Structure formats: structure tokens, C-alpha cells
Design a protein around this nucleic acid. Structure first.
Lengths: 95, 55, 78, 90, 48, 76
DNA sequence: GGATTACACCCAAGACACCAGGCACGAGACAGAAAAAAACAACGAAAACGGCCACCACCCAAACACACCAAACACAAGAGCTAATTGAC
DNA sequence: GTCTGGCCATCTTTGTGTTTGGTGTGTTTGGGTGGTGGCCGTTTTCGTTGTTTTTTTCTGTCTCGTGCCTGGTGTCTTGGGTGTAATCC
């Protein structure tokens, strides 16, 4: 049938990773999916605007990092950049 | 994480939109980030002004 | 149909907003403000619907119309 | 005292404070001035009601702030007009 | 006569309803509580 | 015409910019745009403050009017 | 004869918020002589911005592959809307 | 009796999960150019110095305006009171 995608299973996995003995209602899972989509849209729009400012055809990790820096507040942006750099290096070190 | 903390604070084992609203509006950085969004069934924070309190 | 927003409902909305005493003209003022807000939002939604060549107003039209105003709403499929 | 009891009671709950049918009738009345024979999904009306109540509660909070600034307990239409002007709406 | 009318400015600190009367060369406001709080206005002195 | 003096404003801008990256250069038009935006912003803020002060039946603007204006605007 | 007694229900009062007038003391506007530095112009030095040419790694594109993601709805059960009230005070 | 809590006797459909299976991401290799790097140019930004004079400033003085205190209103609710009402010796 209509096989439409969402983030519900990933949000649930993350929840069980942080809070094992805690569930989530369906309306809150909907809100979290909307939140993820919103933040994705904000970051991608900022990255696109930056790429077009700098005359580049590619969205790399530098654009994503600087869009994160532009969008999130200080400590939050710092932690997010730390996480992203950690993940990128761990993915690049292996193959 | 913050929503699970807020839901345990209310002694619930399932997260509802109310706990998301409390977690968002209670965290300064998140509340600055999500400054324009409204959460259905999120409610408002309990806030009574100083001058309205009885005497 | 604008009379359907009764005085107790406006009182309830003011009490959840922390308001302790209410004038008598607040009700008409609030009805006017709500009418303006709803007029703008429904106009945007109907624009979206007409563009999509539909005769039914969906929840996506309302969500995009609120995103257009800057009133992003979570929990309705956004 | 009942005013404060109600304030405490309504800042705790999250349920919609407008009756559903009046709001639906108002929405249809307004919509009928742009295009006849329009249909609304129930979720569209629900979203509209949530947004309208959230907007009105924020406006009432700003109005309360203005009223307290003037040293009044009672909110007045001039308070609403001032809040809407300062927001940049009027 | 016009009954149950308030006057501004009030001749006394207490707001009281009065009766407004039309006379030959003007109007008279008269409070029911005190005869001394009459306000007489001549037609010749009304501008607008 | 701009009301804040140009060179004190330049020094203020450089002093503030000295925290985010050491020894930056600035275009002149950048400082001009910054001054225009700052003065427009402050004039709007003084408009809102005047509105609040008149609301309080006053004619003198006080810091609590500024605070109320920035609160209603949604400023942190 | 006449008093002790039974019974609705009204008026004085308290607690709450406000418009308007009055009074007073100070903080702000206005003016004036003084110190200050912005501004205007000039010349000097050079960090770095805009451009160009080369060269390669990076991402798009096919094609084939298999495992992670979707909805249905089975199976188990969250804790609201309801009414009374443990626990300090 | 105030107030926030920890729970109840009954409502409602939700919430976690197993399941079938298919499509969408993952591996493989090939090509073409976008994006880094280097090297050169030359504009433009910083840097300083001298002279002028408008702007800032310190201060004084007076008054007008802000803020505090008051009378009187309307309004909801609690309380003491009394006259209507009446029957027993």
C-alpha cells in the first residue's frame, strides 16, 4: 500500500538507548518526526544558501558544520560539532 | 533525555506531548532554538505573576 | 457564527494565560483579533488548496500556511 | 480566589477550551467567503483550533504583561492594541 | 426631558444619574440627590 | 544622516570583533551597513519604548519600558 | 390575658479593584564656558583578495543484490475521566 | 477546612511487537569535472601625523513631572439582626 517513511523506529531506538524503561505516545512520536523534518529543512536550506554564496556545486561536511554553527546556540552547537566530527572520523577511519 | 526526565518527574513511563513541551520550554538553549513552534496538547508552563498573587 | 465564541471561553483562555481581571470590551476585541487571524490563515490554506486543484482543505494546507506565517506546528504530519 | 484557582487549573490541563462545533461553524462561515463548496478534514479544523488557541494565549500573556506594566490587574482593549502594535501586527 | 443621564465633568466627586431638561434659552441638568448640583447651559453659549 | 560618530563606532565594532577571530579586516561599507542597521534598530526600539511610556501615562522613558518592549518583541 | 416561643429573610458590613485630584521633592532639560577628539587631508606599507592555470580525487551513473523498513493487526495494557481524600498546616 | 499529591473504579483505543515481503540502500566499477593548490598581480585596509573646530562635557539652576496618598464609586460575599408568625400556660 502507501509505504510512506518516517523516523519513528529510529526515535524509538534512540529513546531506548538513552532511557530504557520509558515509552512514547504516538502523538509525541508524530511531533518528534515533525521536529526532525523541520530541523533537516532548516539545515539544508542554510547549507544551500551557503553553497550558492560560495559558488560551489557540492554540499560537503564543511557546509553542514558551518550551518550547524550558524543555527544552534553556543554549547549546543559545540556539542553537535563534536558529535559530527567524531562520527565522520570514525566512519572515515574504517571503510 | 529531557523529555524522559520530565515524564519520570510526573511519574509516567510513557512520553506524551506535555512532557515534550515542558522539556523544550524548560531548557534555555532548546527554547531559544524552538522559539516559534507551537506543540499541540503541549499547554503552557505554570507561571503566575508576582503582583497577581494574593495578600 | 462569531457569537459561538462565548464569554466563558474567552475567560478560560485568559485564565490559562494568567489573567486575573477582565474588562467587558475584551470579548469583542478578542473576537475581532481572532477573526483577522483566522481570515489570513484560511485564505492562505485555500490558496494552497486551489493550487493543488482540490475541493477539500487538508491538514497539509493548514500546516504549510502556518509555516508561511512563521507559526510552525508540530504533530500534524509536518 | 476562584480566579486563581481557575488559573492553576487551566495552566495544568491541555484540553481545547473552545467547543468544537462553534469553531467548525465559524471556520465554514469564514471559508464560504472565498470559495463555495469547500471541504475540511477534521484534522485541519483541529490544527486550526490548536493554533488559534496557542496564538490567543500568547496574546493574553503579552496583554497581561502590559496591564501589569501600567499597574493594573484588569486587562483593557487599549492593552491589547498596544501589545499588537508592539509585536508589529497592527 | 431625558432621564438617567450622567454628566462629564461631574459637579461632585460622586457619579450620580440626573435628568436633562430643555428650557426656552438653554438646557438644564438636575441631579435627584441634591438640588444644588444643577448645570445650566444656554443655547447662545453652545458652539457645537 | 547617521547620528553615532563614525570612528568611535568603528572602534566599537573592531573591539567586539576581536573576540571571534584575532586581527580581522573590515570593508568600509560593512561598517556603514552595520551603523545603518544599528541606528534603525535603536530607533524602532525607542518607538516601542515611547509607546510603552505613553501607555503608562508618562512622557519619560525608563529602563523597564525598554525591558517590556524587548520582552514583547521576543528578545533575549 | 399575655407572654414565651418558632421562623423567613433584609440590612451592615468586609474584602477587592479602580478613576480622579493634590502635593512634593527630585531628576531632568536648558544654557554656558571648557576640554576633547572626530574628522579631514595627506602619504606609506603591504596583507590579502580576485584571477588563472593545472591536475586529481571525488561524486554521479549503471547494474545487480540482499537486508532493513513499511503497514496490519495480534497481543498486552497506558493511565484519562471519574469520585474522596494520606499528609502537614 | 486549604493545597499538592498517590490512588481508585471504569473507558477507551492506544502502544509494543511479530510478521510478510519488497524496495531502497549497498557494493562494484567507470568517467568527467569541480574543487584544491599554487603563483601572480595590485587594490584596499591599516597606520600614523598635523591642524581645525564641531561636538562632548561638567555644572548650575529651576521647574515640571513622576509617584505616593486620598475619597468615592461598583461589585461578591458573610454575617447579625428582626419582624413575621404563632401556641402554650
Amino acid at each position: 500500500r502507501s509505504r510512506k517513511e518516517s523516523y519513528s523506529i529510529y526515535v524509538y531506538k534512540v529513546l531506548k538507548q538513552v532511557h530504557p524503561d520509558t515509552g512514547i505516545s504516538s502523538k509525541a512520536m508524530g511531533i518528534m518526526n515533525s521536529f526532525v523534518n523541520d530541523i533537516f529543512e532548516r539545515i539544508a536550506g542554510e547549507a544551500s544558501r551557503l553553497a550558492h554564496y560560495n559558488k560551489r556545486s557540492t554540499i560537503t561536511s564543511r557546509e553542514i558544520q558551518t550551518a550547524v554553527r550558524l543555527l544552534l546556540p553556543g554549547e549546543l552547537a559545540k556539542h553537535a560539532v563534536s558529535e559530527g566530527t567524531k562520527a565522520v572520523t570514525k566512519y572515515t577511519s574504517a571503510k | 533525555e529531557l523529555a524522559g526526565n520530565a515524564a519520570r518527574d510526573n511519574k509516567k513511563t510513557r512520553i506524551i506531548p506535555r512532557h515534550l513541551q515542558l522539556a523544550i520550554r524548560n531548557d534555555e538553549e532548546l527554547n531559544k532554538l524552538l522559539g516559534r513552534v507551537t506543540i499541540a496538547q503541549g499547554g503552557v508552563l505554570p507561571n503566575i505573576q508576582a503582583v497577581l498573587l494574593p495578600k | 457564527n462569531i457569537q459561538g465564541i462565548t464569554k466563558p471561553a474567552i475567560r478560560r483562555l485568559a485564565r490559562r494565560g494568567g489573567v486575573k481581571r477582565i474588562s467587558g470590551l475584551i470579548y469583542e476585541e478578542t473576537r475581532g483579533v481572532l477573526k483577522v487571524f483566522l481570515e489570513n490563515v484560511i485564505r492562505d490554506a485555500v490558496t494552497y488548496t486551489e493550487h493543488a486543484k482540490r475541493k477539500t482543505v487538508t491538514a497539509m494546507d493548514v500546516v504549510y500556511a502556518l509555516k508561511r506565517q512563521g507559526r510552525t506546528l508540530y504533530g500534524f504530519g509536518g | 480566589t476562584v480566579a486563581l484557582r481557575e488559573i492553576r487549573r487551566y495552566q495544568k490541563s491541555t484540553e481545547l477550551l473552545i467547543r468544537k462545533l462553534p469553531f467548525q461553524r465559524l471556520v465554514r462561515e469564514i471559508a464560504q467567503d472565498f470559495k463555495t463548496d469547500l471541504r475540511f478534514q477534521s484534522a485541519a479544523i483541529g490544527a486550526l483550533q490548536e493554533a488559534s488557541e496557542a496564538y490567543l494565549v500568547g496574546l493574553f500573556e503579552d496583554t497581561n504583561l502590559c496591564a501589569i506594566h501600567a499597574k493594573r490587574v484588569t486587562i483593557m482593549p487599549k492593552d491589547i492594541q498596544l501589545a499588537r502594535r508592539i509585536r508589529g501586527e497592527r | 426631558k431625558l432621564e438617567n443621564v450622567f454628566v462629564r465633568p461631574a459637579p461632585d466627586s460622586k457619579r450620580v444619574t440626573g435628568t436633562l431638561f430643555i428650557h426656552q434659552n438653554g438646557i438644564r441638568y438636575q441631579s435627584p440627590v441634591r438640588s444644588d448640583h444643577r448645570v445650566d447651559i444656554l443655547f447662545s453659549n453652545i458652539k457645537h
